Design a protein around this ligand. Structure first.
Ligand code: K
Ligand code: K
Ligand code: K
Ligand code: K
Lengths: 441, 440
């Protein structure tokens, strides 16, 4: 797998083609809300009161060092292109006040519900929120065509570094040795040469051949003709003990934590739908190369995982079947989801639910000897029926549910969450047990 | 002024043309937020824990009795039509929970940010919010084309009444003797016959002739090429004392409270813009006839008020000049705003607005206890800023709705402070020339 190098894309001024991910995203954009909350608008509470003018000047420094934040999109002869502008002030900005968490959440909602223009920009909004005493907060919305979950950490590190440099009178400018998102976009297209792309597509086309199941969850309402794009969230409240045991199960059985969650979630879905086969989408990070680790952009590909469940399999059986499914999918993870879709020709996609695992250390930023936390807003467009979003660090494993309120009332979701965390507790307690001997509630 | 009668529009099934207001609203409709907060998504805290299934059944009863909630819109031969459906379940509904004010505001925000489809519907969203103890809340979003500020009280009275009737096994059905929004729409077109419409348009075309000023407020940011539809709100915090004196000022000088607010706001704007002439829009209620008082719909027309201010006029001068401008404008208030705009051909007309509601429309009685109608704070900032006043039994108060594309909040807080200061001075020195009312 070749290394990403700066200058791969023409540094002459010619506009680079959008990456596989940007192209799929641009196609669907209808000025909807952010599809998901885990990778959406965010904020960080500061243990000082930030100066608004210098914070704004720090933001312009971040735009200079982060080329995707100055990028708009347009078709040029049948090809979508990334048009980079020199204007480091293309940000939707405001200074506002709050006195408590409710007032802060009101400011977050305003930022989170912007519907940014991809043709003209800006693609980023920032609010400098002034709190009581020595408190303040930065609120940020980056359009998902220009970001992913990890981008939030990148943005805040760049912003706090620029803030501090500008305070010391130092300059804040682009790193010419760092690759851009345009370089990564070209690198991705070179990686997916025609033979390598057919090979990876061929894999998923074989795995997902035939009549695929459509997730059949019990709902409070039928799917409406008009989607209203109204997402809810609900924390799992997975007990710390059960969470620690679930992590212990994973390593004891030789599976990653993610493989374990995928298996338990598949069992949960199989029970609730009465369906043997379940499909779970997962957004896999493409940040393998460390040259991507300080770049804002869409460094993700959605990968489809298929599992077959029945209640005579044991916990250990499903863990090991998830290990094989995840292993092969990750081996072909560079297959762009939208080309997988095009190759499969479903009845117009593939997946109606998603599972995500983040390392909680990506939501932790050190600044001036203190630790800061990246917090997500709760509002989203409910792209899927429901998405399980897990985060694990040394301090423990925890999760939340993002759900489509067009289908579910919140107590239904709380009941689902209640069964899922119970199941996960039984998984760790009885790896040898057949699933039918794991009793409900 | 003819009476509104039920059956004015054919009860045969032929689709009535949209009202003047609905037409203007439909033309602009993209998929933007509610333009303003004062007339936007709302909620009411209930002193019991509502039963979700019966509350949903109550909502279907309101749809049956309130025909605009079952209306969608579509052109048919160059004419916008109100297509009424019999589906009393066309509502964006959910049941959700809250344990404190923050969690409730989270449920309000989700309802408030829906972008309802005018061609397909639903045009209404309702959330049955289950709180702690024996407490709950109803959260509601009705599209601007199908409502006005007063509609929220109509909706909630209908809802609580239906809820109780369904509890006692009684039926909840349409009142055939009550006119519909379709009747009002046809009544409005008959009222604005060609001669009567030309007369009212002629009035505003003469009053508003020439090069109109464009509100020139100091902003923190220039007006952006891409509007982001990001509204803020800021409470004015008008002291009870000054608010009472201000009301007392109005009565003593023989002007309505609204007239007094219009004068003080115009003075405030002239000072902040450096402009002698200021235009203020005001949404005027068209619910004169008591036959409209239990109807949900857009019963409003925007009217443009023009005022000339300089600092040698006294408080009493601007009060009496506001009296004449408002009196004449109200006399021609049926002239549809969009037709006034078409007649004037601007390069619309007003960049700011003033509203006065009677807080008795924001207060409803249920089983001996009084309930308050509360507005969300999110909106699309249709105007640079809008001053929203409400006068109830407890006093007079106001808030500012503002465009965050232009203003940071501390700028708006400083404006609200100068406007509140000015209004106190108005009441203290009605004889004084304005140049003797010093800032701060
Ligand atoms: K502070
Ligand atoms: K505030
Ligand atoms: K909740
Ligand atoms: K309750």
């Amino acid at each position: 797998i070749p290394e990403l190098r700066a200058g791969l894309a023409p540094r002459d001024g010619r506009a680079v083609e959008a990456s596989f991910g940007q192209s799929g995203i641009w196609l669907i954009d209808q000025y909807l809300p952010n599809p998901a909350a885990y990778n959406g608008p965010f904020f960080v509470r500061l243990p000082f009161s930030a100066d608004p003018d210098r914070l704004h000047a720090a933001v312009r420094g971040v735009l200079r060092r982060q080329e995707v934040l100055r990028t708009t999109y347009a078709l040029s002869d049948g090809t979508l292109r990334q048009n980079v502008s020199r204007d480091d002030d293309a940000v939707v900005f405001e200074v506002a006040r709050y006195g408590d968490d409710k007032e802060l959440d009101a400011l977050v909602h305003r930022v989170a519900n912007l519907r940014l223009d991809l043709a003209r920009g800006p693609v980023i909004a920032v609010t400098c929120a002034l709190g009581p005493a020595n408190r303040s907060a930065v609120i940020c919305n980056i359009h998902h065509i220009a970001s992913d979950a990890a981008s939030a950490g990148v943005f805040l590190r760049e912003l706090l570094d620029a803030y501090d440099r500008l305070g010391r009178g130092l300059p804040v400018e682009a790193d010419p040795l760092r690759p851009t998102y345009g370089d990564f976009s070209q690198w991705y297209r070179e990686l997916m040469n025609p033979e390598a792309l057919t090979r990876s597509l061929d894999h998923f086309a074989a795995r997902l051949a035939g009549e695929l199941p459509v997730l059949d969850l019990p709902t409070d309402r039928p799917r409406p003709p008009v989607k209203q794009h109204r997402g809810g969230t609900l924390p799992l409240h997975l007990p710390a003990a059960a969470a620690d045991d679930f992590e212990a199960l994973a390593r004891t059985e030789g599976v990653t934590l993610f493989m374990a969650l995928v298996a338990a979630y598949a069992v949960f879905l199989s029970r609730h739908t009465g369906q043997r086969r379940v499909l779970i989408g997962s957004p896999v990070s493409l940040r393998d190369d460390p040259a991507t680790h300080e770049l804002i952009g869409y460094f993700v590909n959605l990968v489809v995982l298929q599992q077959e469940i029945d209640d005579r399999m044991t916990v250990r059986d499903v863990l090991r079947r998830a290990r094989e499914e995840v292993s092969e999918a990750l081996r072909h993870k560079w297959a762009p989801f939208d080309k997988v879709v095009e190759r499969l020709q479903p009845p117009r996609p593939l997946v109606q639910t998603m599972l995500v695992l983040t390392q909680g250390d990506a939501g932790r930023i050190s600044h001036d000897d203190t630790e800061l936390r990246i917090e997500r807003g709760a509002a989203h467009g409910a792209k899927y029926d429901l998405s399980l979003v897990f985060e694990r660090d040394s301090e423990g494993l925890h999760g939340l549910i993002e759900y489509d309120a067009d289908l579910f009332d919140e107590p239904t979701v709380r009941a689902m969450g209640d069964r899922l965390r119970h199941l996960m507790e039984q998984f760790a307690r009885r790896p040898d047990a057949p699933l039918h001997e794991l009793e409900a509630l």
